Amino acid sequence: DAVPAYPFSLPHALDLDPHYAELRRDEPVSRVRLPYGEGTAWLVTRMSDARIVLGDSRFSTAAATDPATPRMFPTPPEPDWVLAQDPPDHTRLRRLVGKAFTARRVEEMRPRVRSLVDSLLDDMVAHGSPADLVEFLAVPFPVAVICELLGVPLEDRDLFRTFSDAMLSSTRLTAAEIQRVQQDFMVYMDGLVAQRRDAPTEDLLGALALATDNDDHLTKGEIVNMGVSLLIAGHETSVNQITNLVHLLLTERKRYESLVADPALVPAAVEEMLRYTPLVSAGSFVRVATEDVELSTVTVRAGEPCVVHFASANRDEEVFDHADELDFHRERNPHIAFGHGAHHCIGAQLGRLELQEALSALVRRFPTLDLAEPVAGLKWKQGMLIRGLERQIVSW
Ligand code: HEM
Ligand SMILES: CC[C@H]1OC(=O)[C@H](C)[C@@H](O)[C@H](C)[C@@H](O)[C@@H](C)C[C@@H](C)C(=O)[C@H](C)[C@@H](O)[C@H]1C
Ligand code: NA
Ligand code: NA
């Protein structure tokens, strides 16, 4: 009617729409119309407000399963989705699998992970320059890690990648196309979990099968969907972010040189590019206020929905100096690239390790790495809730 459409525009590369800085300065909480559901939502663009919306029991994701609630994606959320659970029910669900994702358990993975990266970078040198970093690194690396961690067969790669791409549709597919894929993925994962019934496994799917038979307070739907979410997230974030971080490094090649010179700066640079990159192209899973909640400039009423732009909150000038510049030497970096509060990313430590090991490996072994295709011709993924590159031809 009279509030603006969000997203504000079709995205360009990893650029933020200029309107977010305008809102952060002048209207940090504003009404928008999202592409699906009904009514309006408050768009939250500053770090302080984002930590309230993501971090407070007065903001409920369970309330977002109402199909009338505004949302960024065609299908209404279902009660069994991990994102649609509120504590304390959500806390019990994340304990099903949390143990595998602790910083300590992820750190135990670094040797296997580094070996996988090296092997895949040998396949790329064997092929010779120029080569498609998506084909040789960005896809096969995170897919192998999530397959080994869950106990999902590696030969199912093309099957679960086409499911995962459809479920991360923003505008690419219709609600019916995505609903059909959600059904297929649920039945496939329900299938993998069921193979552990008289044959237990030492992997996350084995942990999910024991929960199915022995745990009294988790529904089979919740458990199976958890397996779906881990398999989507565990490859889709890292696959895209390897392309995003390499894009940022090579298009202002000083950045890449800065890490060629001091490879020990890669962990800090991974944190800085996580802050700087809109992996989530726009918006967030929606939170609905269950009670009135005071944000910086407005009181959100019980029943009003809110949506956060993670990448805008990560450019807040009240939080980060020269927020609009990539700086691998900031003393402090309290970004929310992994979210905040209850739904804080379960895989945050695994995403960190994968980006650290892929980047460290390239910066060490490919000091001459360059983009071998025109910037203008880059195939950015269109019509998806996340951003990344379908292809990234590099030369060494
Ligand atoms: C660079 C890598 C990654 C980024 C930037 C990222 C970002 C995020 C963000 C922003 C959220 C919060 C969503 C919200 O609250 O609205 C989140 C949640 C989630 N992430 Fe990650 N993520 C990454 C890697 C991974 C990995 C490797 C996995 C799995 C192995 C994973 C699994 C999840 C899951 C299951 C959730 C939902 C958690 C819940 O609702 O309790 N992510 N991620
Ligand atoms: C509106 C944008 C968000 O998309 C959604 O909510 C999607 C419908 C999620 O259901 C997807 C399919 C799930 O698999 C997540 C577990 C993936 C995990 C990485 C995230 O939480 C991710 C940040 C996500 O919240 C955003 C892409
Ligand atoms: Na929340
Ligand atoms: Na955006």
Author numbering: 12 to 407
From the primary publication:
The 8.8a-oleandolide epoxygenase OleP, from Streptomyces antibioticus, is the P450 involved in the polyketide biosynthesis of the antibiotic oleandomycin. It introduces an epoxide function to the C8-C8a of the macrolactone ring of two structurally different intermediates, namely the aglycone 8.8a-oleandolide (DEO) and the C3-mono-glycosylated L-olivosyl-8.8a-deoxyoleandolide (L-O-DEO). Substrate binding to the cytochrome P450 OleP is coupled to a large open-to-closed transition that remodels the active site, minimizing its exposure to the external solvent.
This reduces to some extent the volume of the active site in both mutants, which is ~606.7 Å3 in the wild type and ~582.5 and ~566.8 Å3 in G92W and S240Y, respectively. In G92W and S240Y mutants, the bulkier and more hydrophobic groups are located in the cavity, causing, respectively, the partial and the total displacement of the solvent molecules and resulting in the formation of direct interactions between the enzyme and the substrate. In G92W, the tryptophan adopts a double conformation in conjunction with E89. The G92W mutation is also able to alter the arrangement of the substrate with respect to the heme iron. This might justify the uncomplete shift towards the high-spin state of the G92W mutant observed by means of UV-visible spectroscopy.
